Design an enzyme around this catalytic site. Structure first.
Site, PDB file in Angstrom:
ATOM      1  N   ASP A 127     -56.510 -14.065 -17.180  1.00 27.14           N
ATOM      2  CA  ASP A 127     -55.453 -14.672 -18.002  1.00 27.14           C
ATOM      3  C   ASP A 127     -54.321 -13.713 -18.446  1.00 27.14           C
ATOM      4  OD1 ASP A 127     -54.192 -16.888 -19.063  1.00 27.14           O
ATOM      5  OD2 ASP A 127     -55.306 -16.825 -20.943  1.00 27.14           O
TER       6      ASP A 127
ATOM      7  N   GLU B 149     -48.367 -28.743 -23.307  1.00 31.58           N
ATOM      8  CA  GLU B 149     -47.900 -29.599 -24.404  1.00 31.58           C
ATOM      9  C   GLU B 149     -46.406 -29.913 -24.440  1.00 31.58           C
ATOM     10  OE1 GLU B 149     -49.520 -31.743 -26.249  1.00 31.58           O
ATOM     11  OE2 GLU B 149     -50.281 -30.567 -27.996  1.00 31.58           O
TER      12      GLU B 149
ATOM     13  N   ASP C 190     -56.684 -18.827 -15.274  1.00 21.84           N
ATOM     14  CA  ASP C 190     -55.834 -19.793 -15.950  1.00 21.84           C
ATOM     15  C   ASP C 190     -54.382 -19.680 -15.401  1.00 21.84           C
ATOM     16  OD1 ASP C 190     -54.989 -21.780 -17.797  1.00 21.84           O
ATOM     17  OD2 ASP C 190     -54.941 -20.380 -19.486  1.00 21.84           O
ATOM     18  N   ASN C 191     -53.603 -20.761 -15.564  1.00 17.58           N
ATOM     19  CA  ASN C 191     -52.139 -20.844 -15.296  1.00 17.58           C
ATOM     20  C   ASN C 191     -51.803 -20.660 -13.838  1.00 17.58           C
ATOM     21  OD1 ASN C 191     -51.786 -19.203 -18.402  1.00 17.58           O
ATOM     22  ND2 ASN C 191     -51.338 -21.335 -18.076  1.00 17.58           N
TER      23      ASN C 191
ATOM     24  N   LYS D 140     -49.553 -12.727 -14.313  1.00 21.32           N
ATOM     25  CA  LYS D 140     -49.787 -13.588 -13.144  1.00 21.32           C
ATOM     26  C   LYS D 140     -49.882 -12.835 -11.772  1.00 21.32           C
ATOM     27  CE  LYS D 140     -45.408 -14.513 -13.703  1.00 21.32           C
ATOM     28  NZ  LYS D 140     -44.578 -13.697 -14.664  1.00 21.32           N
TER      29      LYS D 140
HETATM   30  C1  SAM Z   1     -51.200 -14.981 -21.855  1.00 21.38           C
HETATM   31  S1  SAM Z   1     -51.826 -13.690 -22.708  1.00 21.38           S
HETATM   32  C2  SAM Z   1     -53.455 -13.938 -22.881  1.00 21.38           C
HETATM   33  C3  SAM Z   1     -53.827 -15.287 -23.489  1.00 21.38           C
HETATM   34  C4  SAM Z   1     -55.322 -15.234 -23.858  1.00 21.38           C
HETATM   35  N1  SAM Z   1     -56.249 -15.267 -22.687  1.00 21.38           N
HETATM   36  C5  SAM Z   1     -55.748 -16.364 -24.735  1.00 21.38           C
HETATM   37  O1  SAM Z   1     -56.451 -17.248 -24.255  1.00 21.38           O
HETATM   38  O2  SAM Z   1     -55.429 -16.393 -25.922  1.00 21.38           O
HETATM   39  C6  SAM Z   1     -51.543 -12.435 -21.643  1.00 21.38           C
HETATM   40  C7  SAM Z   1     -52.064 -11.127 -22.229  1.00 21.38           C
HETATM   41  O3  SAM Z   1     -52.379 -10.150 -21.229  1.00 21.38           O
HETATM   42  C8  SAM Z   1     -51.692  -8.920 -21.511  1.00 21.38           C
HETATM   43  N2  SAM Z   1     -51.455  -8.324 -20.189  1.00 21.38           N
HETATM   44  C9  SAM Z   1     -50.551  -8.650 -19.249  1.00 21.38           C
HETATM   45  N3  SAM Z   1     -50.707  -7.894 -18.116  1.00 21.38           N
HETATM   46  C10 SAM Z   1     -51.755  -7.106 -18.357  1.00 21.38           C
HETATM   47  C11 SAM Z   1     -52.479  -6.085 -17.610  1.00 21.38           C
HETATM   48  N4  SAM Z   1     -52.078  -5.754 -16.356  1.00 21.38           N
HETATM   49  N5  SAM Z   1     -53.532  -5.500 -18.228  1.00 21.38           N
HETATM   50  C12 SAM Z   1     -53.946  -5.819 -19.470  1.00 21.38           C
HETATM   51  N6  SAM Z   1     -53.321  -6.733 -20.202  1.00 21.38           N
HETATM   52  C13 SAM Z   1     -52.246  -7.389 -19.703  1.00 21.38           C
HETATM   53  C14 SAM Z   1     -50.491  -9.291 -22.351  1.00 21.38           C
HETATM   54  O4  SAM Z   1     -50.142  -8.198 -23.191  1.00 21.38           O
HETATM   55  C15 SAM Z   1     -51.003 -10.522 -23.120  1.00 21.38           C
HETATM   56  O5  SAM Z   1     -51.683 -10.287 -24.356  1.00 21.38           O
HETATM   57 MG    MG Z   2     -53.087 -18.734 -20.144  1.00 18.91          MG
END
Ligand code: SAM
Ligand code: MG
Length: 206
Positions: free
Chosen positions: A133, A191, A161-162, A136
């Site tokens: 998650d 939503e 997810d997504n 992407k």
């Molecule tokens: C969409 S959010 C996570 C949503 C979470 N799974 C939830 O259900 O509440 C994406 C998160 O991944 C982190 N992120 C993005 N790329 C990353 C990476 N390569 N390694 C670690 N964290 C990452 C971002 O900082 C962010 O907090």
């Molecule tokens: Mg998500």
């Protein structure tokens, strides 16, 4: 003051401690004003596969950590990778307040960096489930990297997810096309955008 800081103030003022459900709806009552819909799907995966060792990629404010930890067995652990140390901090707090911090260890950095360390530094054999998650365009690279470090046994369940909105057609082409992954698709709804989105279960085969 900021979106994450005051999700936590909201949870802490309105939720009941050691009550993970209340912590969850505190976040997705606040945020309405992977929610509780994409949630049923998560809950079903955990419930069916009863993984002992879960790696989550991307803990934002803690929602899916709490969500999954809630349903884990006494022995089990969730490793959660969060590259952003302010979300790591908020996720931490969210977990303490939910009383699930014994089950979760927050790993702090980029996924591409922490994954190679899982065996030697955090004593992992193989993962029982991976919830993807985060960024992407990492889904596919990290899947490949997980495979390379022999972090996946036959039966490891991946959940992405997504998949859908926005991204991840490469990931999907690869896992559905590769015979080392048995795939199932689950629909979900977003939503404000009124879009069908989706998660992907891909069960490692060898
Ligand atoms: C969409 S959010 C996570 C949503 C979470 N799974 C939830 O259900 O509440 C994406 C998160 O991944 C982190 N992120 C993005 N790329 C990353 C990476 N390569 N390694 C670690 N964290 C990452 C971002 O900082 C962010 O907090
Ligand atoms: Mg998500």
């Amino acid at each position: 003051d900021t979106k994450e800081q005051r999700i936590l103030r909201y949870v802490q003022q309105n939720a009941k401690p050691g009550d993970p459900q209340s912590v969850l709806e505190a976040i997705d009552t606040y945020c309405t004003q992977v929610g509780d819909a994409k949630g049923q799907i998560m809950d079903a995966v955990i419930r069916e596969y009863s993984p002992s060792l879960v790696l989550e990629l991307g803990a934002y404010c803690g929602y899916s950590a709490v969500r999954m930890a809630r349903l884990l067995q006494p022995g089990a652990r969730l490793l959660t990778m969060e590259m952003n140390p302010d979300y790591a901090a908020i996720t931490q707090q969210m977990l303490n307040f939910a009383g699930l911090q014994d089950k979760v260890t927050i790993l702090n950095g980029a996924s591409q960096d922490l994954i190679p360390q899982l065996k030697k530094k955090y004593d992992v054999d193989t993962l029982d489930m991976v919830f993807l998650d985060h960024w992407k365009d990492r889904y596919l690279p990290d899947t490949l990297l997980l495979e390379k470090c022999g972090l996946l046994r036959k039966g490891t369940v991946l959940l992405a997810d997504n998949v859908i909105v926005p991204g991840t057609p490469d990931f999907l082409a690869y896992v559905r096309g590769s015979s080392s992954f048995e795939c199932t698709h689950y629909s979900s709804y977003l939503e404000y955008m009124k879009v069908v989105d989706g998660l992907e279960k891909a069960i490692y085969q060898g």
